[PDB]
Design a protein around this ligand. Sequence first.
Ligand SMILES: *[C@@H]1O[C@H](CO)[C@@H](O[C@@H]2O[C@H](CO)[C@@H](O[C@@H]3O[C@H](CO[C@H]4O[C@H](CO[C@H]5O[C@H](CO)[C@@H](O)[C@H](O)[C@@H]5O)[C@@H](O)[C@H](O[C@H]5O[C@H](CO)[C@@H](O)[C@H](O)[C@@H]5O)[C@@H]4O)[C@@H](O)[C@H](O[C@H]4O[C@H](CO)[C@@H](O)[C@H](O)[C@@H]4O[C@H]4O[C@H](CO)[C@@H](O)[C@H](O)[C@@H]4O)[C@@H]3O)[C@H](O)[C@H]2NC(C)=O)[C@H](O)[C@H]1NC(C)=O
Ligand SMILES: *[C@@H]1O[C@H](CO)[C@@H](O[C@@H]2O[C@H](CO)[C@@H](O[C@@H]3O[C@H](CO[C@H]4O[C@H](CO)[C@@H](O)[C@H](O)[C@@H]4O)[C@@H](O)[C@H](O[C@H]4O[C@H](CO)[C@@H](O)[C@H](O)[C@@H]4O[C@H]4O[C@H](CO)[C@@H](O)[C@H](O)[C@@H]4O)[C@@H]3O)[C@H](O)[C@H]2NC(C)=O)[C@H](O)[C@H]1NC(C)=O
Ligand SMILES: *[C@@H]1O[C@H](CO)[C@@H](O[C@@H]2O[C@H](CO)[C@@H](O[C@@H]3O[C@H](CO[C@H]4O[C@H](CO[C@H]5O[C@H](CO)[C@@H](O)[C@H](O)[C@@H]5O)[C@@H](O)[C@H](O)[C@@H]4O)[C@@H](O)[C@H](O)[C@@H]3O)[C@H](O)[C@H]2NC(C)=O)[C@H](O)[C@H]1NC(C)=O
Ligand code: HEM
Ligand code: HEM
Ligand SMILES: *[C@@H]1O[C@H](CO)[C@@H](O[C@@H]2O[C@H](CO)[C@@H](O[C@@H]3O[C@H](CO)[C@@H](O)[C@H](O)[C@@H]3O)[C@H](O)[C@H]2NC(C)=O)[C@H](O)[C@H]1NC(C)=O
Ligand SMILES: *[C@@H]1O[C@H](CO)[C@@H](O[C@@H]2O[C@H](CO)[C@@H](O)[C@H](O)[C@H]2NC(C)=O)[C@H](O)[C@H]1NC(C)=O
Ligand SMILES: *[C@@H]1O[C@H](CO)[C@@H](O[C@@H]2O[C@H](CO)[C@@H](O)[C@H](O)[C@H]2NC(C)=O)[C@H](O)[C@H]1NC(C)=O
Ligand SMILES: *[C@@H]1O[C@H](CO)[C@@H](O[C@@H]2O[C@H](CO)[C@@H](O)[C@H](O)[C@H]2NC(C)=O)[C@H](O)[C@H]1NC(C)=O
Ligand SMILES: *[C@@H]1O[C@H](CO)[C@@H](O[C@@H]2O[C@H](CO)[C@@H](O)[C@H](O)[C@H]2NC(C)=O)[C@H](O)[C@H]1NC(C)=O
Ligand SMILES: *[C@@H]1O[C@H](CO)[C@@H](O[C@@H]2O[C@H](CO)[C@@H](O)[C@H](O)[C@H]2NC(C)=O)[C@H](O)[C@H]1NC(C)=O
Ligand SMILES: *[C@@H]1O[C@H](CO)[C@@H](O)[C@H](O)[C@H]1NC(C)=O
Ligand SMILES: [Mg+2]
Ligand SMILES: [Mg+2]
Lengths: 325, 323
Amino acid sequence: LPPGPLENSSAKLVNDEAHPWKPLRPGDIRGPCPGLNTLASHGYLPRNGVATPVQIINAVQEGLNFDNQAAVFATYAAHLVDGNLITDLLSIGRKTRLTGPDPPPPASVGGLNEHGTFEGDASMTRGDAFFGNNHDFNETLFEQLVDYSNRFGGGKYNLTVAGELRFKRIQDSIATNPNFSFVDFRFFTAYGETTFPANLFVDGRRDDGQLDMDAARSFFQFSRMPDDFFRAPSPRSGTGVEVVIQAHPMQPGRNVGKINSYTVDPTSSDFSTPCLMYEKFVNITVKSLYPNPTVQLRKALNTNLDFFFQGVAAGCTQVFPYGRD
Amino acid sequence: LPPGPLENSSAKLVNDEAHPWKPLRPGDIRGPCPGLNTLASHGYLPRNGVATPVQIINAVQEGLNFDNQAAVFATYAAHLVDGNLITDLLSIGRKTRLTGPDPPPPASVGGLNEHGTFEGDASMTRGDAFFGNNHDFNETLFEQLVDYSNRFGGGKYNLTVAGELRFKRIQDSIATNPNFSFVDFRFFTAYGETTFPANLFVDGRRDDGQLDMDAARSFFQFSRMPDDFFRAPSPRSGTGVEVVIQAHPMQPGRNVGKINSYTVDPTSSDFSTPCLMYEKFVNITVKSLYPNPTVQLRKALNTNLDFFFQGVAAGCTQVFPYG
Ligand SMILES: *[C@@H]1O[C@H](CO)[C@@H](O[C@@H]2O[C@H](CO)[C@@H](O[C@@H]3O[C@H](CO[C@H]4O[C@H](CO[C@H]5O[C@H](CO)[C@@H](O)[C@H](O)[C@@H]5O)[C@@H](O)[C@H](O[C@H]5O[C@H](CO)[C@@H](O)[C@H](O)[C@@H]5O)[C@@H]4O)[C@@H](O)[C@H](O[C@H]4O[C@H](CO)[C@@H](O)[C@H](O)[C@@H]4O[C@H]4O[C@H](CO)[C@@H](O)[C@H](O)[C@@H]4O)[C@@H]3O)[C@H](O)[C@H]2NC(C)=O)[C@H](O)[C@H]1NC(C)=O
Ligand SMILES: *[C@@H]1O[C@H](CO)[C@@H](O[C@@H]2O[C@H](CO)[C@@H](O[C@@H]3O[C@H](CO[C@H]4O[C@H](CO)[C@@H](O)[C@H](O)[C@@H]4O)[C@@H](O)[C@H](O[C@H]4O[C@H](CO)[C@@H](O)[C@H](O)[C@@H]4O[C@H]4O[C@H](CO)[C@@H](O)[C@H](O)[C@@H]4O)[C@@H]3O)[C@H](O)[C@H]2NC(C)=O)[C@H](O)[C@H]1NC(C)=O
Ligand SMILES: *[C@@H]1O[C@H](CO)[C@@H](O[C@@H]2O[C@H](CO)[C@@H](O[C@@H]3O[C@H](CO[C@H]4O[C@H](CO[C@H]5O[C@H](CO)[C@@H](O)[C@H](O)[C@@H]5O)[C@@H](O)[C@H](O)[C@@H]4O)[C@@H](O)[C@H](O)[C@@H]3O)[C@H](O)[C@H]2NC(C)=O)[C@H](O)[C@H]1NC(C)=O
Ligand code: HEM
Ligand code: HEM
Ligand SMILES: *[C@@H]1O[C@H](CO)[C@@H](O[C@@H]2O[C@H](CO)[C@@H](O[C@@H]3O[C@H](CO)[C@@H](O)[C@H](O)[C@@H]3O)[C@H](O)[C@H]2NC(C)=O)[C@H](O)[C@H]1NC(C)=O
Ligand SMILES: *[C@@H]1O[C@H](CO)[C@@H](O[C@@H]2O[C@H](CO)[C@@H](O)[C@H](O)[C@H]2NC(C)=O)[C@H](O)[C@H]1NC(C)=O
Ligand SMILES: *[C@@H]1O[C@H](CO)[C@@H](O[C@@H]2O[C@H](CO)[C@@H](O)[C@H](O)[C@H]2NC(C)=O)[C@H](O)[C@H]1NC(C)=O
Ligand SMILES: *[C@@H]1O[C@H](CO)[C@@H](O[C@@H]2O[C@H](CO)[C@@H](O)[C@H](O)[C@H]2NC(C)=O)[C@H](O)[C@H]1NC(C)=O
Ligand SMILES: *[C@@H]1O[C@H](CO)[C@@H](O[C@@H]2O[C@H](CO)[C@@H](O)[C@H](O)[C@H]2NC(C)=O)[C@H](O)[C@H]1NC(C)=O
Ligand SMILES: *[C@@H]1O[C@H](CO)[C@@H](O[C@@H]2O[C@H](CO)[C@@H](O)[C@H](O)[C@H]2NC(C)=O)[C@H](O)[C@H]1NC(C)=O
Ligand SMILES: *[C@@H]1O[C@H](CO)[C@@H](O)[C@H](O)[C@H]1NC(C)=O
Ligand SMILES: [Mg+2]
Ligand SMILES: [Mg+2]
């Protein structure tokens, strides 16, 4: 089973004795999530960056007070598209042989770096896949984050900044990336993630939604908590995401083979249709990766698909791409 | 000090031996909030409907698993504008001399029923104040809620139903209430509130976002928990509000002297500017109720303003009406 919520979810020192930062050994895997990167680099996750969904959920909860439903939702979503369902292993970065024997195509078990499954365009501190590297910290983008913190956050990162910067990264991609895609699951995650630094990288004794540019660079670039960093004083994730959505209302869509041809996708879900997004993710995205699984793979798919459904906070009705039972 | 978060926030029986439903005595106070109403009728709050901030915050958390920031934000906003800052008492309903000696005008201490401070138009199950009773359960509107739950919820109330019903109640008021006002604070809370029934009134052992009509009537009409009701399995309030907002985009505004004259207000806060909403609440709303507090009043104001600010989940810069 996925973990339950924390028993004691108060703020506490998480940059402590048993969870020191350490530099990367060769073979250590890091990817497009500064959240999971930091947990790994503090040993809340295995330090090589290869983990079970359960390990990942306990980590985000213990290390950072990510809420339970959000942790279940994101973990099992990633695992379903990016992880190996038999070994129950997911890489938080590049495709690796340490996740075990692969399933048939088109499932690719590419880990969190796999473009177009979880990872997607218009990341705040990462370049679009189309340009070549979709997971490494990018200094130009980060210093754009700083600018926007200066203009909009009086020098801090907060949900007002998130609003502006989220729109700016969208415009950037429309303008430069002929393969820009911003529909369905990526349309969804791209908004919440911009709340995460304000809600979770801010020291929990303060919990005031103003993230400083030191704490920011530390998380985004080095996967390192600040000294004496306390986690937030309660479980949360994308609280305030409506601030980011309403700052510059966008319709989901994509460039159509060239820059500046952003075209609305009338079949995409959006924020008014979360159950449609859940249903698409299950009955199209996951299903296309595993169209005709063997008996063993089917039972693993169904188990993980169960756990995924549990993390859908809107409720919705479970769908069953391989039948009930 | 405001209570902090529950120590143990898991689901548990809350309709219990310690907390039985009991019919109203005469002079028992109930108001426009089904949540506070139900806690008072179960003895989580004082049964007569008059309570401290600290009592209200413990109630909503213990009885229903309202989250600690949302409890502080809502509780100290209400008290600031509707409660007695000297006696530390707020009526969850009508103005009552039971909150103690009134401060001077233009402060009203009208309790939760006070139109235009916290209470406002386009409620799900309460009529707009213009029509003359802004607090009693209204059966025709609940019937619309039942209908919309059949149409969009498969028989149940859920976030998709909340999205359609919130827009329809807006349209209703624009079409019928020449005094419709839907800006600033009321614009913000009217959305979050339509998530509550699906997030909070749903038995905690399911937590599946689908509220049945038996349980909805219970809460909204009789301020009664279902038999064997468990509270939610974690602390929450307005999870999913973005769904309700995007279902039918609306700007803040009001009718101007007549029906079908909805006039957007570009000076209002909206969901993109929660710090401006906080600001305007403190600097215009509270300030105008207490333009010149005596030294004692001013002390109590600042103390409660501090607490209100703690509850502002977006963060924001604290603002100071009295320095
Ligand atoms: C939320 O609301 C609060 C109000 O509830 C906002 O705070 C208020 O901000 C306004 C506008 O900025 C300030 O107005 C300015 O006040 C100064 C003088 O202020 C001094 O005197 C005030 C009066 O004293 C009271 O009590 C005495 C008796 O003891 C009475 O006689 C008085 O009449 C008053 O009742 C006093 O209140 C002030 O104390 C407060 O502020 C100080 C900080 O300065 C704190 O230490 C205190 O603790 C307390 O908070 C203070 O001692 C005026 O001189 C200003 O006039 C200038 O600007 C005008 C336009 O705004 C212009 O018309 C004038 O001609 C003059 O313009 C000139 O000066 C400007 C620079 O000041 C130049 O920029 C300009 O070009 C030109 O050169 C001005 O009216 C209030 O003081 C302040 N009130 C409080 C209680 O703090 C708050 O800003 C709001 N928050 C947000 C985010 O909006
Ligand atoms: C429980 O809650 C409900 C809803 O809030 C409430 O019923 C509502 O009562 C109000 C107040 O009377 C009604 O408002 C009127 O609506 C009609 C429109 O007819 C509608 O019919 C259906 C509903 O059956 C609507 O859904 C549909 O959209 C139709 O439009 C308007 O014509 C009325 O306008 C008159 O009164 C206004 C307010 O005073 C004036 O501003 C306006 O100019 C009109 O005034 C004219 O008549 C006046 C006398 O009435 C007089 O001054 C002049 O002659 C003047 O020219 C009005 O806005 C609303 O429709 C009701 N909704 C329902 C029944 O679904 C219940 O009463 C409430 N229960 C309680 C409080 O106990
Ligand atoms: C709140 O609760 C409601 C209801 O449970 C949820 O609403 C559902 O929303 C989903 C979006 O994810 C809708 O799914 C979409 O359905 C499309 C088809 O629409 C029409 O056909 C449907 C098929 O009905 C079948 O089954 C019924 C009986 O079971 C038979 O009558 C029919 O013959 C069919 O066999 C109808 O149900 C529907 O009314 C339409 O006419 C489909 O093409 C899309 O791909 C997608 O799957 C679904 O339609 C909604 N169901 C209802 C009853 O409204 C909502 O998500 C919940 N919200 C939350 C937040 O929990
Ligand atoms: C629960 C397991 C989680 C998974 C599986 C996950 C996965 C991911 C993935 C795949 C991305 C890349 C999306 C893109 O293209 O930008 C991402 C981005 C992001 N993640 Fe996570 N994440 C998880 C938890 C967290 C946590 C706990 C945090 C911080 C508290 C976090 C913070 C962020 C941020 C801020 C980004 C955007 C990075 C940027 O745009 O520069 N994530 N995450
Ligand atoms: C924290 C203290 C609280 C205060 C001070 C408060 C206050 C109020 C007030 C004044 C209103 C009337 C607004 C209007 O509709 O005109 C309201 C409405 C409402 N409240 Fe609360 N409330 C609190 C907690 C809760 C809780 C814990 C719940 C649990 C679900 C809740 C559920 C609701 C709902 C569903 C409405 C909408 C009623 C309708 O539209 O018919 N409230 N509340
Ligand atoms: C980190 O992300 C930034 C943001 O995009 C990347 O900077 C961009 O780098 C590209 C090529 O390296 C620059 O493109 C060049 O621009 C000229 C026109 O000015 C064009 O004619 C050339 O053909 C070429 O495409 C682009 O200007 C530049 N953008 C900004 C805002 O600096 C950077 O490459 C990323 N770092 C990586 C991928 O390591
Ligand atoms: C829940 O955890 C919190 C934070 O860790 C506890 O409060 C602290 O407990 C630690 C013990 O490791 C003490 O060193 C601190 O002095 C406490 N901080 C305070 C009181 O601000 C709290 O005791 C825990 N609650 C329960 C019921 O175990
Ligand atoms: C999600 O996908 C599954 C599999 O495609 C759908 O189940 C199929 O539905 C068709 C049409 O009713 C049946 O003829 C097949 O036998 C079903 N295959 C099964 C059950 O393995 C399922 O209905 C989809 N769910 C939704 C809500 O669209
Ligand atoms: C937290 O609350 C519950 C009581 O509501 C405690 O355990 C629950 O209640 C009984 C007691 O064992 C169990 O049968 C239930 O399964 C428990 N509910 C759960 C686990 O959701 C629990 O022990 C309390 N405190 C701690 C620290 O767990
Ligand atoms: C609709 O709004 C108007 C105007 O805001 C209210 O008019 C008030 O009337 C009362 C007494 O009848 C006076 O105390 C106020 O001075 C008036 N205000 C203004 C600005 O003119 C009106 O009463 C509201 N209608 C109802 C039925 O509540
Ligand atoms: C982010 O921080 C900024 C600056 O501290 C806050 O923005 C200020 O908000 C006030 C009133 O809301 C306005 O003067 C400007 O919009 C801002 N000032 C400046 C200098 O930009 C903002 O409220 C913060 N947002 C959150 C959610 O904390
Ligand atoms: C982008 O899509 C185009 C057209 O579909 C195709 O050439 C290629 O697969 C993609 N290009 C890159 C650089 O990924
Ligand atoms: Mg990306
Ligand atoms: Mg009302």
